[PDB]
Amino acid sequence: VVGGTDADEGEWPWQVSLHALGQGHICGASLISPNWLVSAAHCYIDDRGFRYSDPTQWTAFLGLHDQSQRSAPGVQERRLKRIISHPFFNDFTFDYDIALLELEKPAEYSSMVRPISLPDASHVFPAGKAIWVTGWGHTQYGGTGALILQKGEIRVINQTTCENLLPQQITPRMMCVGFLSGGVDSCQGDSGGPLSSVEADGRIFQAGVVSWGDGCAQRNKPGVYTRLPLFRDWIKENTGV
């Protein structure tokens, strides 16, 4: 996250850190039930001789605040049993960039570990709506990740503007969220993490999944996120949640 600040301990208890292959934190995810996470399909693709598609190579850290304090009280580690990528996902256009991760053993809910609510299929997050993005990704494009979880407030951008800013790249599964002036954005290592939207009655719903962007925090180049309402039924069919 570029242009954000340190999250408070326990502030985003659905935010998960996914480590693989002894490389440390790679991608984010969100807790949606005791046994299931939502993430980005693109994080789980074999590449460069590393078998990122093998669920047995991953460790999920729940309740984590600081990557250098993985043994802090309340942090839970879980293995993955399987990774279900959306059947229409592909890594040419990155359309349908969403995956479901099954934990080998259930999370234990606490003040530090608890799920985020999924939005109904009919919900639309309108242009201008404030949304939070969180993660341990780079704090500058080309930079280095954050030890302490970062948060930043961004806003939904008009879909036609999004399409025009990123020509031939934005499908209707994608949503631009950020600022046209830049400054606050997700970045490399935030992929797969949730957008968290505070709704009118104070309830928080997941509003999307960090996917991609042209650089980070640049003017006219807001982050691109997978929309979540479209996938409510698919999530229910595959997880029971």
Ligand X SMILES: *[C@@](O)(c1nc2ccccc2s1)[C@H](CCCNC(=N)N)NC(=O)[C@H](CC(C)C)NC(=O)Cc1cccc(CNC(C)=O)c1
Q: Which stretch binds ligand X (CB under 6 A): 16-24, 105-113, 123-131, 180-188?
A: 180-188
Q: Cα-flanking dihedrals φ and ψ of residue 145, to 5°?
A: -70, 170
Q: Decide: helix, strand or coil at residue 125.
A: coil
Count Cα neighbours of 80 within 13 Å in the Cβ-side half-sphere: 29
Residue selected from 6, 11, 33, 148 as contacting Cl ion according to rule CB under 5 A: 33
**CB 111, min distance to Cl ion, A:** 20
In 58-98, beta strands by DSSP E: 58-62, 76-85
Stretch of 16-24, 155-163, 182-190, 201-209 lying at the interface with ligand X (CB under 6 A): 182-190
Distance in Å, CB of 11 to ligand X, minimum: 20
Residue 85 touching ligand X (CB under 6 A): no
Question: For residues 99-128, which are near ligand X according to CB under 6 A?
Answer: none
125 binds Cl ion (CB under 5 A): yes
Structural contact between residues 65 and 149, judged by C-beta atoms closer than 8 angstroms: yes
Residue 117 designated active-site:
no
Shortest Cβ distance from residue 41 to ligand X (Å)? 9
How far is it, in rounded angstroms, from Cα 215 to Cα 187? 8
Q: Does 184 bind ligand X (CB under 6 A)?
A: no
Q: Is 42 a catalytic residue?
A: yes
Contact flag: residue 227 with Cl ion (CB under 5 A)? yes
Query: Given its phi and psi angles, is residue 202 left (phi above 0), alpha (psi -120 to 50 degrees) or beta?
Result: left
Residue count, binding to Cl ion (CB under 5 A)? 13
Rounded to 5°, the CA angle 84-125-121 comes to: 50
With contacts defined by CB under 5 A, name the span among 47-55, 97-105, 130-138, 185-193 that binds Cl ion. 97-105
C-alpha distances (whole Å) from 164 to each of 49, 155, 220, 231 are 36, 17, 10, 25
- The interface region with ligand X, picked from 5-13, 74-82, 115-123, 188-196 by CB under 6 A, is 188-196
Angle (CA) 234-239-241 rounded to 5° is 90
Residue 35 interaction partner, one of Cl ion, ligand X, none, beta carbon < 5-8 Å per kind: Cl ion
* Residue 97 is a catalytic residue: yes
Paired sense of beta strands 36-39 and 99-103, if any: antiparallel
Query: What is the residue type of 80?
Result: L
Phi first, then psi, for residue 22 (nearest 5°) are 70, 15
Q: Which residue in 17, 30, 186, 191 is the catalytic one?
A: 191
Q: Which residues bind Cl ion (CB under 5 A)?
A: 33-35, 78-79, 104-105, 124-125, 157-158, 227, 229
Q: Which residues bind ligand X (CB under 6 A)?
A: 26-27, 42-43, 94, 137, 169, 185-191, 210, 212-214, 216, 223
Residues assigned a catalytic role: 42, 97, 191
